[PDB]
Every structure is written in structure tokens, then in C-alpha cells.
DNA sequence: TTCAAAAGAAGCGGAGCTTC
């Protein structure tokens, strides 16, 4: 009773009765929220939040008094105080818009009159705001406190929401648009990454509002109100922001992008503030004034970020103690601004940075339409990073007179896949530009003698930054290769940088000088290398040179190598020994490093190996069609087209074929992760078409630079030698484009057959509008699929081992079958509860369930083991937030628009997520977590998932630690973890309770194509338990293998570059043995251990 | 079916069907 009259004392005048059993209008705000035991917001109880916070922001003394802090962020100075005054006057405008919209809503259809007479309009999807209004004569009005507090949240969101949005990729955009990932138009992905979908905008806004309101949710109130009221408020504020043009609304019609698509999708983009807006230097004053414990803030000095209790976006999953330990260690790391890079960026200027690293200024008529769009996105990324870096520099600059001495901490959270992600869009972990300006790495080096170990480390850092592949050569050979570069092509750039570090000035041709010197070595870290080398050259005391230059220990083909180590489940084979050595697991070779392996044993990494297996598979495919001239010719054209535009494919003088590890990298990785072959083909084609769209701009350009130039010279001039030599390239291009768009291979009964499309490419090429579209894209894709990708996937399987493929399949099926049941049972338990609600007069459709009831249902699924536990990590593969559960609107704005679907945290099908969740999680995820918490964990590093940036003083020990952490993670057994969960699932699952939809879903994973169609519950059941048996056997094999491997002498250098491998001190010596010998010895050990258990 | 976050709009009526 105390909580009822407690919230009622604060909001005495709201309309209705705070009793769900009441007869007249019930107030669902007071029914839904309670006062927190401990204060969360400083506006609770305030009668005019906007006036009170404006007052608070009016001066440093008033701010300090309001927040009850003795000192305030020094970035809150005069200039910024003035901007916040203006922003506060704008909050008055948004408030005034909101009040008018309510008035309009109350008047239309006489909703107001009707509400007054007892019509329960405060329960409509569009009338939930009626729960925070107050009677005012013959009409109603907002409660001023709730409204003004909501607006303050509107203001903060407006200020920083953009810099916290998720990055969207082709996959997301496809889902959003309902358009096939492979067939997405150019820059359509870019268009969507720039904007926020309705859902995306309202949910972040609503979160902020509910947070500033500073109340607590009633565990016994219907979600329709606890989520609904704050969301109805956010929807209104977003609408107000559109009227005021702080937010631009764009309704994107798919019908034009694709005739059959009926979706029209809203995109919301927040208007940009000027880059030189004072508010950028301290964009969180409001958050920090309103919230007792602010989330949005920078962390300077010994202001350490708190440690997150739950997995990122999986509130059902608690961060394990080991994970929380790792998060604490990373958040404890101090970052410092490298002043010379900041000065270099400033001196170059945003515009020359774009010209150097972006796409420069765009001549939208020397550019192919599609090329133009890809370049715009490029500039966007660089421009945003630039602006975000200098907003941070501004705030740091105020904290003291020397910005290089201000320690900066970053918040981290653990993701669904066990990775420690730095919060924020633009930070050192996620933005290369920021990465070179704000570093945790620092070292005092003795570079007075080029024969020092310190100088050798300096060299390694420089070479790696300059795109020398340092893990493929010894330190000594690296040295010589660096020297040749510094004295050769780079010297002009170096000299310019020397001058910059003397006078602070750059020449007007600086971009030209850099661009020419670096060539394809150009990058932000390369700029750091030039900067740091030059600083060294002008250094006064070379004996104590201070630099944040780093060396990154980076995993060699990490994911695939981890999968092979973690999930290969049978006896040892010689191929496995040789292949895994490509990833740094060396057997019987004490102290062997990746540098040595690559320069003396095997110059081919896992990607090159799969590329070599692709060539064999291609050759095999050719023989099977050696007499079929049309197919031979089809293949030749696909290879010819790729050759023309991709660097990783070369076709020799005599038709010889040569492939670089490049093409195999992505396909190898994602294939293991469950990617279809079709998805891969679309990617390859997209990379071809992109190179093509570009060459078209090379035409438009070189053609306006000389209206005399021939088509063949305007397109293949740069790539050819003579004139008629370019005429045959133009002849190939055209031949290839027509044959690959007019004819496609289809696989009928095991054999490939060419079919006509009737949609072949015909017409004179117009370099500006030229665009491979729809049916022509699909055709290129079909050819890419069968003549390239399928051979590649055969090569991939041959490389990583059919045994790994088998493990990942069982893993995939198990986790999938489990997610289907979890999803289905959860929906059914929900439908059952909603059926009970129809018996309830107090309840109304739209109210949905209480958090309590959802907690009950989520808890009833516990005996199906939704979580996978490793002992230091927890994975919840099925976990998601989806609209399919409630299948209804949560709220709309007051114009009956902006209809937000009611989204619920609930399990959903995993598809193939099981593989990468477990592989990334127990692989690199576990290594990094281990690296953070292990005895003598390296300090002052930046961890980027599968690579670690290390200061030049500690490269050797940190590197060995990294490799030890790799070994530690290779003690894992993800299949065993999955098994332990699936086994419990199988003990409790009732397949008969499943919807026929769930049943077919399961049958797809569990049963062969044939046995499906019309199999019984019992057929599924029996099949689902076979998978469990397979899992148990794999898990046993993995466990045996790891124990056996531990008995043997191993040198592990998976985190390569520095050449500091981890030795495991196996007692059994396998040196001076061929892989064949080794595999036999290991297999003996395997059998004997297999017996230790059998008895 | 790669993973790391989801995600149509809007008239009429007061939910949820419907048409674009
Ligand atoms: N597109 C992707 N999809 C899924 N996982 C990815 C993707 N890109 C990277 N990863 C994961 O992150 C890891 C690190 O990727 P990285 O860019 O370092 O390449 P890599 O696979 O380590 O090979 P290398 O480092 O030799 O180029 C990968 O091994 C993989 O597990
Ligand atoms: N799981 C996953 N990781 C990625 C993906 N792209 C990049 N990464 C991770 O981020 C790293 C790239 O870092 P950067 O390219 O910013 O230097 C990769 O080494 C990898 O660990 C991706 O698409 N999926
Ligand atoms: Mn790597």
C-alpha cells in the first residue's frame, strides 16, 4: 500500500484511479511504476524540470550545487554554458510542439470529450499518453514534470544518439528491406546505415525517457503499459523532432528498388550539429545533471567505468566471474592522446584527410553513378571518425594543460559471442583513425644504437605499420626490408614529416607526397609510422625516445585454426598436422616461431592452401566437361572477367591460372560458420561489379581529359601496354559480360547444364549510368556459384578437414533443434497465458503479459538447458528480442503513425549461429579473456578480438602470454559443452507438444531429405537423440586429442609477429619426425588413452 | 540460413485487416 500512495503523492493529479479492478478510467502509469528505494533521477518531484535543469546548467556553481558535486567537468565552461542555454530554449520549443499535438489529438474525433465520459482511450495503442495527462477544465493537459523530463531525454538523445547506433551491414539491410542480400543496389546499404529505422529510433529514445523518469517498473503490470507509455512518449518526441527538423524523416519505397516489394520503410536521421559547435566538447551535461549514475560520459583519470552485470543485450545471461574480471582489467587500462598525430590530423585538415584516406571531393560527373555512391559512404566513415576524434580531443583538452597526460578509460561489455567490445561507435578498438590518436601503449626506448633490442622492436612496429608482413619473416630479414623502404620510396614522405616535426607546417602538396610514397601501403597506422620515424630522426635524446608505436600480435587465420583445434574429433591425420602448423601449432620443434615456419618450412598459410585446393577442384571440374566446349568457354569467361578486375586472380600468357590467398579469406571463414555457397558467390560478384563500376569512372575521367581517346584505351589504358593490346581486353570484357549474363549453369541431377536467360546484357555502355542489375546480377551470380565457389568449398573442406565439417554440422543441428523447441514452447506458454487473460475483466487485449509472467515462462524452459556453460563463459544461442511473440503494436504517435511493434526478449531459432557463437566464443573470446586475467596478464594493451596491440617495451613477454592464452583456450571443448546441454534437453523435451511448424523445422536438421515429408513425432524424437550420441562421441575424441597433444612437445605461435612462441614442455619428444610418423605416435597415445577410460 | 542487435507504412477505429 505504501508504493501505491507513494507514487500517488508525486503524481496526485493524473487522470483515473490507480486500481486495475476500478470501474471508470484507470491510471496505468501509477499502476505500472513505483518510486525507487534509491534516487535514480534528480527531476523526480521537480515541478518544472526544464526550468530547473536550465537553471542548473546556467553556471558552474549552480551545476555543482544541483549535482551535489564539489567540482564539475572543466569542459563545462563559458562557451559551452551558452550553447546549453540555447539548447534549453529549444527544449521549450519541443515541449510546446508536444502540447499542441496533444490538443490536436484530444480534439480530433472528439477523443477528449469521449475520454472525459469514460471511454477507455488511455488503453488504445495511440492513447497511452492519456495516462500522463491531467484534467484542465473541459479538456486535458500533460503532467508538466513527466513531459518536461521526457523532453530533457529527447535533448540528450538528440545530442549523442547518433554516436551510439549499431553499424548495419548487407545482412541487416536485407532483413530490414526484405530484399535478397546478393541483389542489394549500390549504396542502399549506405543509405540505411546512415539512418535509424523507426524501431531503432524509438527504442533508444524510450530507454532514455524511462531512465530520466527515474521510476521502477511494477513486476505485476502489463508490458503494454510499462513498455508502452514510455514508447508512446518517445514516438511523440520523434514526431516533434520531425516538425522541428532536428530529425529528418525519409519513407523509403522498395517498390522502385524492386517492383514486387510492397514494403515502405521509414528512415530517421538526426540533423548534424556543426563540427565546431562548443556543445560537442561536452555533449553529456544533461545526462550528468539528471541521472545520479550517468551512463553517457567520458571517463578521465581515476574515474573507472562500472562493470556490466549482464551479457550485452542478453539480460538473461550474467557475465561470469571470469568475464567480469576481464572486463575490469580492460576498463582499468589508461589511454592517452598522442599529441603529434592529433596535430598532424589538424594540420592536414578534415578535407585533406578525406582526400588522403577517403574519396576526396566528388566530381559527380567524372564518376559512375554506383561508384559515386560507394565513395560517399567512404567519406562518411572517415569524416565521422575525424569529427568524433576532435570532439573527444576538445573535452580532453579542458581537463588539463597537457592533453597527453590525461588518462582516458573506456567502458567494455561482453557480447553474445564472448568478445570484449569497447562501447561506442568511434573508439580505439573500432576506428582506425582514432586508434592512432588515442593509445594505451607507450614505451621509453633506447634508440641511440640501431643494434639495440629496443631499436629492433621499433623496427618491427614500423614495418608492420608500413604493411610489411612481419610474421612471415625473421626479425633480421624484416629489418633489412624496412631499411630498404625507409631509404627508398618513403624518404620523400619521411623528409616532409621531419620538417613537420621541426616547424609544424606541411607543404600544400602533402597529400600528393604521402599518397605517392605509401602507394597501397597507405593507412592510418602507416601515417603513425611515418610520424614516429620522423620524430625519432629529430629526437634530442634518442636514448630515451617516448612513443606509443605498437606491434600487434595478430592471430594467423584465427577462427579456422581455432575451429580445427577445438572441434576436430577423430584420430590425427598427417594433413591436419601440416595444416594446423600453418596456424602456429608446431609439433616436435622446440622454440619454433611462425616467422621461421613461413620462411623455411611452408610459405603457404591456410588461405593459400585452400586456394591451391580450389585450383585442383577447378581442374577436376574441367575434366568432367572436357568435351563440352560451351561449358569450357563459360568457365574461361568467368575466370577472364575476374582476371580483368580482381587482383587476386591472374591469368597467364598461355591461359595459366594463378590465385592469391586473398579470394579465399572471407569464403573460408564464413563457410565454416555456416554460410551458404550462394551468399559467397554474391560477395565475389559484388567485388567484381565494384571494380567494374570504378573502371567506368576511369573512363568518364580519362575521356573528358581527352575526347579523342578510344573506348578500349579509356577503360583498359592504365591496365594495358599498347593500343590493340587494350582492344582485346575490351573484347574480352564485352564477350565475358554477354556470355555470363545470357547463359547460366543449372544443376540438373548431378550434372551441370547451360541454360539461356533471355535477359543477357545488350547495349552500348554509358560509363555514368552503367549498372549491372537484377537478372544480370543473378546470372553473374549463378556462374560464380557453380564454376568458382563450389570448387572453392571443396577445396575448403579438403583443407580444414571433413572431420571438422562433420563436427560443425552436428553442432549446428543440435543448437538449431534446441532453439526451435525453446522458441515454440515459449510462444505456446505465452498463448496459454493470454487465453487465461480473456477470463480477466481487468485485462484488455493489448496489455500483454507482466514481466513476472514472462519471467515464469522463461524459467519453465530451464529444464531444456537454454544456456551453454563452459565454466568461464555462458552462451545463450537462442536468445533474442523479437516481434513475433506478441505480434502486435506497442504504441503509435498521436497521428496514428510511427507504429512500434511490441518486442519481447525471447528465444528464437539459431539457424547456423551455433557454429560461430561457439567458435568465436571459445576460440578468440576465451584467449582474450584469458589474456586479461591470467597470471602476469599483459598491461597497457588494446585487444581487438584476435589481435593485441602491444607497447614496444613488452612485445616479447606479452606475445608469449598471448600464445599461452591460445594454448589455454585450446584446452576447451565446445562440443562437450553443447553436448552437456543437449543431453539435458533430450531428457526433458516432449516433441509431441510442438506445433507442426516446429516439427518440420526440426525435421530439416534431424532428418534426411526423404524421411522428412511425413515422418512421425517418434521419427523426429529418435533422430534428435541420434545427434546427441554423435555429439558425445565427438566430445570424447576432442578431449582425448587435447590430452594426447599435451603429452607431446609443442611450440605455439598462433599470435604471430614478434616471434615469441609458447612452449608447453611436453615430455614426449616428436622432433625429427615426419607428420606421418607424428600422427602414428599421437594415434598410439590416443588409443592407449582411449583404453585408460574404457577400463 | 555466416556471427557480433531488432527493424514496413498508414486509413479506419479503438484491433487488426487491408492495400500499397
Ligand atoms: N566476416 C566475418 N564473419 C565471421 N567471422 C569473422 C568475419 N571476419 C572475421 N571474423 C572472425 O574474426 C577472426 C579474425 O579475423 P581477421 O580479420 O584477423 O582474419 P583471420 O581470419 O585472423 O585471418 P588473417 O588474420 O590471417 O588475415 C576470424 O578468424 C574470424 O573468426
Ligand atoms: N565476427 C566478426 N568479426 C569481425 C568481422 N569483421 C571484423 N571482425 C573482427 O575485427 C577485426 C578487424 O579489426 P580492424 O579491421 O578494425 O583492424 C578482425 O580481425 C576480427 O577479429 C566480422 O564480420 N565478424
Ligand atoms: Mn588475425
Coordinates of N, CA and C in Angstrom, one line a residue, chain A residues 796-902:
Chain A
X796 N 38.0 -25.9 -49.6 CA 38.0 -25.5 -48.2 C 37.8 -26.7 -47.3
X797 N 36.9 -27.6 -47.6 CA 36.7 -28.8 -46.9 C 37.9 -29.7 -46.8
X798 N 38.6 -29.8 -48.0 CA 39.8 -30.6 -48.1 C 40.9 -30.0 -47.2
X799 N 40.9 -28.7 -46.9 CA 41.9 -28.0 -46.2 C 41.7 -28.1 -44.6
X800 N 40.5 -27.8 -44.2 CA 40.2 -27.8 -42.8 C 39.8 -29.2 -42.2
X801 N 39.5 -30.1 -43.1 CA 39.2 -31.4 -42.7 C 37.7 -31.8 -42.7
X802 N 37.3 -32.8 -43.4 CA 36.0 -33.2 -43.4 C 35.5 -33.5 -42.0
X803 N 36.4 -33.9 -41.1 CA 36.0 -34.1 -39.7 C 35.5 -32.9 -39.0
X804 N 36.1 -31.8 -39.3 CA 35.7 -30.5 -38.7 C 34.3 -30.2 -39.2
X805 N 34.1 -30.3 -40.5 CA 32.9 -30.1 -41.2 C 31.8 -30.9 -40.5
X806 N 32.1 -32.2 -40.2 CA 31.1 -33.1 -39.6 C 30.7 -32.6 -38.2
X807 N 31.7 -32.1 -37.4 CA 31.5 -31.6 -36.1 C 30.6 -30.4 -36.1
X808 N 30.9 -29.4 -37.0 CA 30.2 -28.2 -37.0 C 28.7 -28.5 -37.4
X809 N 28.5 -29.5 -38.3 CA 27.2 -29.9 -38.7 C 26.4 -30.4 -37.5
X810 N 27.0 -31.3 -36.7 CA 26.3 -31.8 -35.6 C 26.0 -30.7 -34.6
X811 N 27.0 -29.8 -34.4 CA 26.9 -28.7 -33.5 C 25.7 -27.8 -34.0
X812 N 25.7 -27.5 -35.3 CA 24.6 -26.7 -35.9 C 23.3 -27.3 -35.7
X813 N 23.1 -28.6 -36.0 CA 21.8 -29.3 -35.9 C 21.3 -29.3 -34.4
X814 N 22.2 -29.6 -33.5 CA 21.8 -29.7 -32.1 C 21.3 -28.3 -31.6
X815 N 22.1 -27.3 -31.8 CA 21.7 -26.0 -31.3 C 20.5 -25.5 -32.0
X816 N 20.3 -25.8 -33.3 CA 19.1 -25.4 -34.0 C 17.9 -26.1 -33.5
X817 N 18.0 -27.4 -33.3 CA 16.9 -28.2 -32.9 C 16.4 -27.8 -31.5
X818 N 17.4 -27.4 -30.7 CA 17.1 -26.9 -29.3 C 16.4 -25.5 -29.4
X819 N 16.9 -24.7 -30.3 CA 16.3 -23.3 -30.4 C 14.9 -23.4 -30.9
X820 N 14.6 -24.3 -31.8 CA 13.2 -24.5 -32.3 C 12.3 -24.8 -31.2
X821 N 12.6 -25.7 -30.3 CA 11.8 -26.2 -29.2 C 11.6 -25.0 -28.2
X822 N 12.7 -24.3 -27.9 CA 12.7 -23.2 -27.0 C 11.7 -22.1 -27.5
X823 N 11.9 -21.8 -28.8 CA 11.1 -20.7 -29.4 C 9.6 -21.1 -29.3
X824 N 9.4 -22.4 -29.7 CA 8.0 -22.9 -29.9 C 7.3 -23.0 -28.5
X825 N 8.0 -23.6 -27.5 CA 7.4 -23.8 -26.2 C 7.1 -22.4 -25.6
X826 N 8.0 -21.5 -25.8 CA 7.9 -20.1 -25.3 C 6.6 -19.5 -25.8
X827 N 6.5 -19.6 -27.1 CA 5.3 -19.0 -27.8 C 4.0 -19.6 -27.3
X828 N 4.0 -21.0 -27.2 CA 2.8 -21.7 -26.7 C 2.5 -21.4 -25.2
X829 N 3.5 -21.3 -24.4 CA 3.2 -20.9 -23.0 C 2.7 -19.5 -22.9
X830 N 3.1 -18.6 -23.8 CA 2.6 -17.3 -23.9 C 1.1 -17.3 -24.4
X831 N 0.8 -18.0 -25.4 CA -0.6 -18.1 -25.9 C -1.5 -18.6 -24.8
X832 N -1.0 -19.6 -24.0 CA -1.8 -20.2 -23.0 C -2.1 -19.1 -21.9
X833 N -1.1 -18.3 -21.5 CA -1.3 -17.3 -20.6 C -2.3 -16.2 -21.1
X834 N -2.2 -15.9 -22.3 CA -3.1 -14.9 -22.9 C -4.5 -15.4 -23.0
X835 N -4.7 -16.7 -23.1 CA -6.0 -17.3 -23.1 C -6.6 -17.2 -21.7
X836 N -5.8 -17.3 -20.7 CA -6.2 -17.1 -19.3 C -6.7 -15.7 -19.1
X837 N -6.1 -14.8 -19.8 CA -6.3 -13.4 -19.6 C -7.7 -12.9 -20.1
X838 N -8.3 -13.7 -21.0 CA -9.6 -13.4 -21.5 C -10.7 -13.7 -20.4
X839 N -10.3 -14.5 -19.4 CA -11.2 -14.7 -18.3 C -11.2 -13.5 -17.4
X840 N -10.2 -12.6 -17.6 CA -10.0 -11.5 -16.7 C -10.6 -10.2 -17.3
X841 N -11.6 -9.7 -16.5 CA -12.3 -8.4 -16.9 C -11.3 -7.2 -16.9
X842 N -10.4 -7.2 -15.9 CA -9.5 -6.1 -15.8 C -8.5 -6.0 -16.9
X843 N -8.3 -7.2 -17.6 CA -7.3 -7.3 -18.7 C -8.0 -6.9 -20.0
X844 N -7.2 -6.3 -20.9 CA -7.7 -6.0 -22.2 C -6.6 -6.3 -23.2
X845 N -7.1 -6.9 -24.4 CA -6.2 -7.2 -25.5 C -5.3 -6.0 -25.7
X846 N -4.0 -6.2 -25.8 CA -3.1 -5.1 -26.0 C -2.2 -4.9 -24.8
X847 N -2.7 -5.3 -23.6 CA -2.0 -5.2 -22.4 C -0.8 -6.2 -22.3
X848 N -1.0 -7.3 -23.0 CA 0.0 -8.4 -23.0 C 0.2 -8.9 -21.6
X849 N 1.5 -9.4 -21.3 CA 1.8 -10.0 -20.0 C 2.6 -9.2 -19.1
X850 N 2.6 -9.5 -17.8 CA 3.5 -8.8 -16.9 C 4.9 -9.4 -17.0
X851 N 5.9 -8.6 -16.5 CA 7.3 -9.1 -16.5 C 7.4 -10.4 -15.7
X852 N 6.6 -10.4 -14.6 CA 6.5 -11.6 -13.7 C 6.1 -12.8 -14.5
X853 N 5.0 -12.8 -15.2 CA 4.6 -13.9 -16.0 C 5.6 -14.3 -17.1
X854 N 6.3 -13.4 -17.7 CA 7.3 -13.7 -18.7 C 8.5 -14.3 -18.1
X855 N 8.9 -13.9 -16.9 CA 9.9 -14.5 -16.1 C 9.6 -15.9 -15.8
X856 N 8.3 -16.2 -15.5 CA 7.8 -17.5 -15.1 C 8.0 -18.5 -16.3
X857 N 7.6 -18.0 -17.5 CA 7.7 -18.8 -18.7 C 9.1 -19.0 -19.1
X858 N 10.0 -18.0 -19.0 CA 11.4 -18.1 -19.3 C 12.1 -19.1 -18.4
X859 N 11.5 -19.2 -17.2 CA 12.1 -20.1 -16.1 C 11.6 -21.5 -16.3
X860 N 10.4 -21.7 -16.9 CA 9.9 -23.0 -17.2 C 10.7 -23.8 -18.2
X861 N 11.5 -23.0 -19.0 CA 12.3 -23.6 -20.0 C 13.7 -24.0 -19.5
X862 N 13.9 -23.8 -18.3 CA 15.2 -24.1 -17.7 C 15.6 -25.5 -17.8
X863 N 14.7 -26.4 -17.8 CA 15.0 -27.9 -17.8 C 15.3 -28.3 -19.2
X864 N 15.3 -27.4 -20.2 CA 15.7 -27.6 -21.5 C 17.1 -27.1 -21.8
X865 N 17.7 -26.6 -20.7 CA 19.1 -26.1 -20.8 C 19.3 -25.1 -21.8
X866 N 18.6 -23.9 -21.8 CA 18.8 -22.9 -22.9 C 20.3 -22.4 -22.9
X867 N 21.0 -22.4 -21.8 CA 22.3 -21.9 -21.7 C 23.3 -23.0 -22.0
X868 N 24.5 -22.6 -22.6 CA 25.6 -23.4 -22.7 C 26.7 -22.8 -21.8
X869 N 27.2 -23.7 -20.9 CA 28.2 -23.2 -19.9 C 29.5 -23.9 -20.2
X870 N 30.6 -23.2 -20.1 CA 32.0 -23.7 -20.3 C 32.7 -23.8 -19.0
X871 N 32.2 -23.0 -18.0 CA 32.8 -22.9 -16.7 C 33.5 -21.5 -16.5
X872 N 33.6 -20.8 -17.6 CA 34.1 -19.4 -17.6 C 33.4 -18.5 -18.5
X873 N 32.5 -19.1 -19.3 CA 31.7 -18.4 -20.3 C 30.3 -19.0 -20.3
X874 N 29.3 -18.2 -20.7 CA 27.9 -18.6 -20.8 C 27.4 -18.1 -22.2
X875 N 26.9 -19.0 -23.0 CA 26.3 -18.7 -24.3 C 24.9 -19.0 -24.3
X876 N 24.1 -18.1 -24.8 CA 22.6 -18.3 -25.0 C 22.3 -18.1 -26.4
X877 N 22.5 -19.2 -27.2 CA 22.4 -19.2 -28.6 C 21.0 -18.7 -29.2
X878 N 20.0 -19.2 -28.5 CA 18.6 -18.9 -29.0 C 18.1 -17.5 -28.6
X879 N 18.9 -16.8 -27.7 CA 18.4 -15.6 -27.1 C 18.2 -14.5 -28.2
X880 N 17.1 -13.8 -28.1 CA 16.9 -12.7 -29.0 C 15.8 -11.7 -28.5
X881 N 15.5 -10.6 -29.2 CA 14.4 -9.8 -29.0 C 13.6 -9.7 -30.3
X882 N 12.4 -10.3 -30.3 CA 11.6 -10.4 -31.5 C 10.2 -9.9 -31.4
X883 N 9.6 -9.5 -32.5 CA 8.2 -9.1 -32.5 C 7.2 -10.2 -32.7
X884 N 7.7 -11.3 -33.1 CA 6.8 -12.5 -33.5 C 6.0 -13.0 -32.3
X885 N 6.6 -12.9 -31.1 CA 6.0 -13.4 -29.9 C 4.6 -12.7 -29.6
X886 N 4.7 -11.4 -29.3 CA 3.5 -10.6 -29.0 C 2.7 -10.3 -30.3
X887 N 3.3 -10.2 -31.4 CA 2.7 -9.9 -32.7 C 1.6 -8.8 -32.6
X888 N 2.0 -7.6 -32.2 CA 1.1 -6.5 -32.0 C 1.8 -5.2 -31.9
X889 N 1.1 -4.1 -32.0 CA 1.7 -2.8 -31.8 C 1.8 -2.5 -30.3
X890 N 2.9 -1.9 -30.0 CA 3.1 -1.5 -28.6 C 2.6 -0.1 -28.4
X891 N 2.9 0.8 -29.3 CA 2.4 2.2 -29.3 C 2.5 2.8 -30.7
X892 N 1.8 3.9 -30.9 CA 1.9 4.8 -32.1 C 2.0 6.2 -31.6
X893 N 2.4 7.1 -32.4 CA 2.3 8.5 -32.1 C 0.8 9.0 -32.2
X894 N 0.6 10.3 -31.9 CA -0.7 10.8 -31.8 C -1.4 11.1 -33.1
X895 N -0.7 10.9 -34.2 CA -1.2 11.0 -35.6 C -1.5 9.6 -36.2
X896 N -1.5 8.6 -35.3 CA -1.8 7.2 -35.7 C -0.7 6.7 -36.5
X897 N 0.5 7.3 -36.4 CA 1.7 6.8 -37.2 C 2.8 6.4 -36.3
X898 N 4.0 6.1 -36.9 CA 5.1 5.6 -36.1 C 4.7 4.5 -35.2
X899 N 4.2 3.4 -35.8 CA 3.7 2.3 -35.0 C 4.8 1.3 -34.6
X900 N 5.2 1.3 -33.4 CA 6.2 0.5 -32.9 C 5.7 -0.9 -32.5
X901 N 6.3 -1.9 -33.1 CA 5.9 -3.3 -32.8 C 6.3 -3.6 -31.3
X902 N 5.5 -4.4 -30.6 CA 5.8 -4.8 -29.3 C 6.9 -5.9 -29.4

